[PDB]
């Protein structure tokens, strides 16, 4: 995969975490931008990004070791639609409905273990554990084996140790999969075993591997959102916290704004499949495209005062952090839900938060698939 850093040439981790300067420059000076080093055409404007992602005919997701029945992301029509549906049966609204109380409890539990005398590391205490545990419980891992699950997860999805983890994971999970085919429950594994689209169904092996792709998709990213939300409430605009506390009805909207403004730096790759000029330039088959959804989320043509955090900007929900078109994130309702709940619960308990002057950002960022991610975020909370 094309690495962010090669295109960006950022001196600091902090700048990759808060790239507002660069995004403005690219949006205004070089919106459709060839990068020789990576031989990559780089797309920044909302309208263009939106249209590249929607126009799969011309911008294919087929890449330039995984049973293609479960290769959803790296597939075009007509295959993609069927591969998506087999999974989507495990993420119905009903299931989100059902999952809320379970997710509620997991959150309460974790907020419980935070007091507010000592400094809290939100990352270790909430950002990382919540989605992992939620997946664990939502899939069908029993409560006691959670720590073992985290262990395989951290190893596999937080950047030979993995070889081991995979196998333990696989042989831990395969039995359970086999068990649940026989004795269904209300969970993802069970949902996925009953999934049938145009006759096709999942093999047990495919269900197991599907759970790995799910975790692959939805732990790093949700966790990044969470850590980042908190970073924002500490550093970006300190009034927001107090605003949210007094009116919890606003937390969803604030989540969209963290998705818009604070999920840096996310991109996607496509490959040109049929020659075209949709970006006002002729691209040819095999040309690689990279769309910078973080930048598009800061395009003034779409969002007013885009370089300011504003949770009341009425169109924040139109951000492209979850992509756009056929591949639009299947787990967005879940990620949104987890964050709503995680944030509400914490707001409901603590009244104020505060930064810690020792803590330096540079020292607590590492490379992730979505540009710099927080290793720890220490704060102090009251109540």
Binding site for ligand HEM (CB under 6 A): 61, 72-73, 84, 87, 214, 217-218, 221-222, 225, 263, 268, 321-323, 327, 329-331, 334-335
**Smaller CB distance to ligand HEM: residue 73 or 242?**
73
**Smaller CB distance to ligand HEM: residue 313 or 336?**
336
Q: Of 298, 123, 353, 105, which Cα lies nearest the Cα of 225?
A: 123
CB 65 → ligand HEM: shortest distance, Å?
18
**Smaller CB distance to ligand HEM: residue 63 or 352?**
63
CB 256 → ligand HEM: shortest distance, Å?
11
Tell me which residue has its CB nearest to ligand HEM: 331
**CA–CA distance, 227 with 121 (Å, rounded to integer):** 10
**CA–CA distance, 220 with 154 (Å, rounded to integer):** 9
CB 47 → ligand HEM: shortest distance, Å?
17
CB 225 → ligand HEM: shortest distance, Å?
4
CB 262 → ligand HEM: shortest distance, Å?
11
Q: Which two tokens stand for residue 161?
A: 């140790």
CB 321 → ligand HEM: shortest distance, Å?
5
Three-state secondary structure of the chain: CCCHHHHHCCCCHHHHHCCHHHHHHHHHHCCEEEECCCCEEEECCHHHHHHHHHCCCCEECCCCCCCHHHCCCCCCCCHHHHHHHHHHCCCCHHHHHHHHHHHHHHHHHHHHCCCCCCCEEHHHHHHCHHHHHHHHHHHCCCHHHHHHHHHHHHHHHCCCHHHHHHHHHHHHHHHHHHHHHHCCCCCHHHHHHHCEECCEECCHHHHHHHHHHHHHHHCHHHHHHHHHHHHHHHHCCHHHHHHHHHCHHHHHHHHHHHHHHCCCCCCEEEEECCCECCCCCCECCCCEEEECHHHHCCCCCCCCCCCCCCCCCCCHHHCCCCCCHHHCCCCHHHHHHHHHHHHHHHHHHCCEEECCCCCCHHHHEECCCCCCEECCCEEEEEC
**CA–CA distance, 70 with 203 (Å, rounded to integer):** 11
**Smaller CB distance to ligand HEM: residue 149 or 381?**
149
**Smaller CB distance to ligand HEM: residue 84 or 380?**
84
CB 11 → ligand HEM: shortest distance, Å?
26
**Smaller CB distance to ligand HEM: residue 323 or 381?**
323
**Smaller CB distance to ligand HEM: residue 242 or 271?**
271
Determine if residue 23 is labeled as part of a ligand binding site: no
**Smaller CB distance to ligand HEM: residue 49 or 240?**
49
**CA–CA distance, 72 with 216 (Å, rounded to integer):** 13
CB 89 → ligand HEM: shortest distance, Å?
12
Q: Binding site, residues?
A: 329
- Annotated binding-site residues for heme read 329
């Amino acid at each position: 995969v094309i690495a962010v850093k090669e295109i960006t040439r950022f001196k600091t981790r902090t700048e990759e975490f808060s790239p507002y300067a660069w995004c403005k420059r690219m949006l205004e000076n070089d919106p459709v931008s060839y990068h020789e080093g990576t031989d990559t055409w780089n797309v920044f404007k909302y309208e263009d990004v939106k249209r590249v992602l929607s126009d799969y005919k011309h911008f294919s997701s087929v890449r330039k070791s995984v049973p293609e029945k479960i290769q959803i992301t790296e597939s075009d029509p007509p295959d993609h639609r069927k591969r998506r549906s087999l999974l989507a049966a495990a993420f119905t609204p009903r299931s989100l409905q059902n999952w809320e109380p379970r997710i509620q409890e997991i959150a309460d539990e974790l907020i419980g273990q935070m007091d507010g005398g000592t400094e809290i590391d939100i990352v270790a205490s909430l950002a990382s554990p919540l989605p992992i545990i939620v997946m664990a419980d939502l899939m069908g891992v029993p409560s006691k084996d959670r720590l073992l699950f985290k262990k395989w997860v951290d190893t596999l999805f937080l950047p030979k140790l993995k070889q081991v983890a995979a196998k333990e994971y696989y042989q831990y999970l395969y039995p359970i999969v086999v068990q649940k085919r026989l004795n269904p429950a209300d969970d993802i594994i069970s949902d996925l075993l009953k999934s049938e689209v145009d006759g096709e169904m999942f093999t047990d092996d495919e269900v197991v591997r599907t759970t790995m792709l799910i975790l692959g998709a939805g732990v790093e990213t949700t966790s990044h959102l969470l850590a980042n939300s908190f970073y924002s409430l500490l550093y970006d605009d300190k009034e927001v916290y107090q605003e949210l506390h007094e009116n919890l009805d606003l937390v969803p909207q604030a989540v969209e704004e963290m998705l818009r403004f604070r999920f840096n730096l996310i991109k996607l790759d496509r490959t040109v499949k049929e020659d075209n000029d949709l970006l006002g330039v002729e691209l040819k088959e095999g040309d690689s495209v990279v769309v910078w959804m973080s930048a598009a989320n800061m395009d003034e043509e779409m969002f007013e005062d885009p370089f300011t955090l504003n949770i009341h900007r009425p169109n924040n929900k139109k951000h492209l952090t979850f992509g756009n078109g056929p591949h639009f994130c299947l787990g967005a309702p879940l990620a949104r839900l987890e964050a709503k709940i995680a944030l509400t619960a914490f707001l409901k308990k603590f009244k104020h938060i505060e930064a810690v002057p020792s803590f330096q950002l540079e020292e607590n960022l590492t490379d992730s698939a979505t540009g710099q991610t927080l290793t720890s975020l220490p704060l102090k909370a009251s109540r």
